[PDB]
Amino acid sequence: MRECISIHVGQAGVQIGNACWELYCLEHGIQPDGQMPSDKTIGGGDDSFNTFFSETGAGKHVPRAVFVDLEPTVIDEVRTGTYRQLFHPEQLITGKEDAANNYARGHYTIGKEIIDLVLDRIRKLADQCTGLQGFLVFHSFGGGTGSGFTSLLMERLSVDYGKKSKLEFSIYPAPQVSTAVVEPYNSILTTHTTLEHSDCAFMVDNEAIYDICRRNLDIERPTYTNLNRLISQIVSSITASLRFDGALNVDLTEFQTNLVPYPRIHFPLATYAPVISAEKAYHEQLSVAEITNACFEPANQMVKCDPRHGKYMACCLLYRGDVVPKDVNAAIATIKTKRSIQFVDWCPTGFKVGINYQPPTVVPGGDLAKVQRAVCMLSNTTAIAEAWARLDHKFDLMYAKRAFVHWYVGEGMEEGEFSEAREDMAALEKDYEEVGVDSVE
Amino acid sequence: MREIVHIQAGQCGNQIGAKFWEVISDEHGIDPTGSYHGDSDLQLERINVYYNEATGNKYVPRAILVDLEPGTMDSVRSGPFGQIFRPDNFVFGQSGAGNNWAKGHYTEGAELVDSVLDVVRKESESCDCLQGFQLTHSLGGGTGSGMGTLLISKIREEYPDRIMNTFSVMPSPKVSDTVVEPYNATLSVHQLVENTDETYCIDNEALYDICFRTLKLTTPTYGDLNHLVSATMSGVTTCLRFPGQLNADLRKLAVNMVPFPRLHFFMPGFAPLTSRGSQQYRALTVPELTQQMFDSKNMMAACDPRHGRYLTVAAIFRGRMSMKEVDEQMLNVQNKNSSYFVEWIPNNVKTAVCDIPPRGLKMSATFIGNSTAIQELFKRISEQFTAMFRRKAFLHWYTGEGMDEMEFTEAESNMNDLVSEYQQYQDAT
Amino acid sequence: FNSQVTVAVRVRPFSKREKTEKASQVVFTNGEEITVEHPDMKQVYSFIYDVSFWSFDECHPGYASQTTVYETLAAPLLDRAFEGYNTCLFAYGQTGSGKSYTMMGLNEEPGIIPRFCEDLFAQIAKKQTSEVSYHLEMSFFEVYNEKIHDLLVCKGENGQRKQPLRAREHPVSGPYVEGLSMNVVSSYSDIQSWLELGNKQRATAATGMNDKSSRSHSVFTLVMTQTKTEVVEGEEHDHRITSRINLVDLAGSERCSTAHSSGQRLKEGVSINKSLLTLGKVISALSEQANGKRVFIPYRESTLTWLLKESLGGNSKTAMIATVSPAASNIEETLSTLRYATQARLIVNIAKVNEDMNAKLIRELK
């Protein structure tokens, strides 16, 4: 088999994990109580797979997930929610208090007495794995818990297990929209560490998915209960290769070795075909040829990043449903055929491909309509450095006068630690320039 | 009787194996259970070529499966013909290489190759007269390549007198699957050329165009392309299992095809295909088959001969035919299109004929070619390689498993050398 | 220096074997020119060489001992070694033609190899000064069934101690062996001890053609580095040269019709003939190259050629020695050998001296 762990840290991930496990259970005919009246009716099928869900003797199934956010008023929603009789009650609500946008509490002060259990219950989970492992950690950058905690966890995990893929689906801080003033402090301080431990940190933005939700989905007034689902589908579109069959299936490690030229540039993006509403569910064929153009459209990017201000290093596409390989080959050729899309000289190969048969499902209460096929795209480009530029500059201004810092120092973080990340992130930006520049002889 | 061990390694191979036996079973009157229900002893006189027998007049194939890192394991077993395969021959591990050759050669495959090799020894010892080995794989990937060449070498040391054949899907010029194929393959070629008697270079792109235009199929799948690969695999050995006016075998193919020990890569082809409609709009003749046979668009290798020349070919026909028309037709080709052929080989072609046609055809043929056009594929992989190597574009992933720069370098020198060798004879004299 | 290879020849006389089964003479030396009479007396082939010796008899002019042959053939290569040139000498010919008897010889009449070796050690004694410091190393290995084995290793204790090695190609200096235990030389005495061990452990065997046959290929490498003063007022001893000497004892065709044998015997014979054929093709394309022909050289078709690439060509002052018999029983073999040699004269490489002024500025100033 293959196994994969879902961890949700903070609120942003937990709220998502609610969206994720909802889809997973639905996609696999599983009921909220872990039961399988569909398996009762069928009498067969391994659908309730060990990829994501354990199983007991009673026919109940349990997902491989934990979570913690140091905020009981969220997890408790799940302890009372419809899925309360799903999860293992050893979900770690230690939320005596919250990190409150302060990295240091989650990393140093109150990261204590919490992380000891996170690792423990994790070990218990790995001990049930007779196969692959790989970690899905859901957090938000700029946050007080989604970072200061998730810095510790990946560090400890790089020690206990080390030789496992450690993936992250994470909210990047937007250029304009912010729910805090300390995102830049909180964000940059994080990158100093997760750069070294992780191997692939899939990033997203809320501004982009917002605009997306308006245009294609015809949604005037979105909220987290519509955004997360898109973020959930993407995660499925990845992981579906593990649970279902397919002509060209992919594991998690396959991504790591193809998208990641050098150890330190593991910061890619994502898109999809959520161009769907019940009205526009018609009037289009939704061919392999259409979507692939869309999957390079600047507008349908999930972060506020102009690719056309940079170049592509490597890319991977994961299709679902009734999909024909030949049609993919024509389509990818077309994508090279276009001149706006500038690749590095390095990679005439450029592309990876993966394909599954199992089409997407739809959640009732939802918006994205039914289809016969869909794709997910991932991409590593240089354009993001500009976004990294924004955060380093925002930092620069409100650090110079050392604003807000006495708080972080008030928890014990030394002044210079700020600069340490800065020199790093500047050097990181410098790396994107080195590589982006064409080669010579 | 001559006996072969067939091996499956990699997502692409096992499916080819999967489609393969489905054809052989049909060519021998066997069911998904392994029972006989045919109508001719000919389907049984030489069944021991590919299969072993079992108690209740069942017939087990000599197939082995080694990259069943389980994701494709169920795919094979829960299939229309999954059940015939020896369950004990389902060898595997876990934690797939992620297309990293080194994992597929040095670390993981190292742990597993013993076991698969042990099983091979059994199937070997159970034979009466072992001839050669038949591996399916692909380059560019981790398992099919690394574990392949590993397993190929060891077997060669154990059976160096014997034959080792492969049918290896090659990386494309244009449409990639993985992004490190230049890395994954060139390493393979380094070990492939040196530990092989022949290999059949197949490209996906040609198969697409082939099925797209001549077969006039608008929705082809990986399931159907393979259906053509299995044909050639069967045609090469039709004269082995079945009789004819003029017999052929694997050893007889090489010695007439391999002038120099390193130029043992080939460009196969197969006839006839007509998209069902035009079936009413032709008739099957020897010149007809020959015409498709040397068709520049029926070459599944994607190396246009017309920019190069042939060293030697083998045109294995199958059915009731007259030899005069056969031998005449090759001569015509040698005559009219002589510039595509070598002077210093006086006759640039051989032949072979088996008197047993396939399931629903009156006459069929199989093409085998050795040509200078193969240079082009080899340049591509080399040119793609260097552009990445000099910057160490993806290198760090292998070095984490213990490879070093020399190894990547070594293969490069070797691959370029193979090119130059072909280029030696590329110019007419 | 685009320059040619010295090709030398030695007609050994007939033996007890011919005495028992009469085999006439057909090779004849006009002082040095080689002439062969067909037993049919229909043709005389003749071949010209840069060097000849007539060991058929001790008396007629043209005769030469091991050391006469040395100072004809190998002492000049000693000279070019101290000049700094890499150098090669390799043997060729059939079984029982004294190919070892010439290169290595035995205890009582050792070969060109030991003669050169003592000459080299004493030639270093001639300049054992602080003007130039000298450092000499050597390796010694064997080729059997395309497998490489170390002659200077005391094997362990086991049923199978013939530890194989493998080859690797430095992008600059070319091929080399992993684990090749190149050892330091203090003197010809040490060289002698090393050679004794290696020739003892060599996979050789008795047969129907000779009492002891070189059934494996042998390579004997020396490399002498010499660090000299530069022409500066500062660090003077910053110049160095290296010179790589390569002495090669090959095997013979051993046509199975006379070399009636079985099993591993025939296996070794097959591998040998295959190797020598590959070498011959290399030699031929090299000759064509020397004729100005643009030609692909299948160095890689085996191991011998691959390792000896820089010696068969490359950058070295080189030579070959061909051993031939007088008995008409093997006239075909001797003719093949002579044709190999007379073609071999035509070969050239481009030979210079290995200063290796790397991180030195010396070559750049030059």
Ligand SMILES: CC(=O)O[C@H]1C(=O)[C@@]2(C)[C@H]([C@H](OC(=O)c3ccccc3)[C@]3(O)C[C@H](OC(=O)[C@H](O)[C@@H](NC(=O)c4ccccc4)c4ccccc4)C(C)=C1C3(C)C)[C@]1(OC(C)=O)CO[C@@H]1C[C@@H]2O
């Ligand atoms: C059945 C029939 O009368 O119709 C023909 C047919 O329409 C044609 C077009 C067949 C058909 O070929 C295809 O339809 C096809 C589709 C996708 C990919 C590959 C093939 C046929 O399937 C192919 C099939 O050939 C065989 O039966 C041989 O067994 C062939 N393999 C199989 O088709 C086969 C596959 C699974 C199970 C059983 C048989 C074969 C190939 C190599 C070595 C031995 C046998 C034949 C005569 C036909 C059909 C069935 C329509 C052709 O191929 C063969 C081998 O005959 C395509 O051009 C030829 C000409 C045939 O007339």
Ligand SMILES: Nc1nc2c(ncn2[C@@H]2O[C@H](COP(=O)(O)OP(=O)(O)OP(=O)(O)O)[C@@H](O)[C@H]2O)c(=O)[nH]1
């Ligand atoms: N996309 C998305 N983002 C969310 C959601 N919920 C919260 N966020 C983001 O989370 C960020 C707020 O900081 P968080 O890291 O969530 O705070 P936390 O994780 O609860 O830990 P604290 O910072 O201590 O609250 C904001 O940028 C929000 O946009 C959600 O459902 N979807």
Ligand SMILES: Nc1ncnc2c1ncn2[C@@H]1O[C@H](COP(=O)(O)OP(=O)(O)NP(=O)(O)O)[C@@H](O)[C@H]1O
């Ligand atoms: N010209 C010669 N004069 C006197 N004795 C010779 C001469 N050539 C060879 N011999 C002796 O006769 C023997 C036959 O030579 P031999 O050493 O068998 O050839 P070889 O070099 O071993 N060939 P191979 O074993 O294939 O490498 C040797 O032991 C020599 O001592």
Ligand SMILES: Nc1nc2c(ncn2[C@@H]2O[C@H](COP(=O)(O)OP(=O)(O)O)[C@@H](O)[C@H]2O)c(=O)[nH]1
């Ligand atoms: N003809 C054919 N090719 C395939 C099929 N599946 C995968 N491939 C090819 O095989 C390659 C994938 O390599 P693979 O062997 O899966 O990698 P590995 O198994 O990890 O070594 C890709 O280039 C695919 O185009 C198939 O069903 N048929």
Ligand SMILES: [Mg+2]
């Ligand atoms: Mg919080």
Ligand SMILES: [Mg+2]
């Ligand atoms: Mg000898």
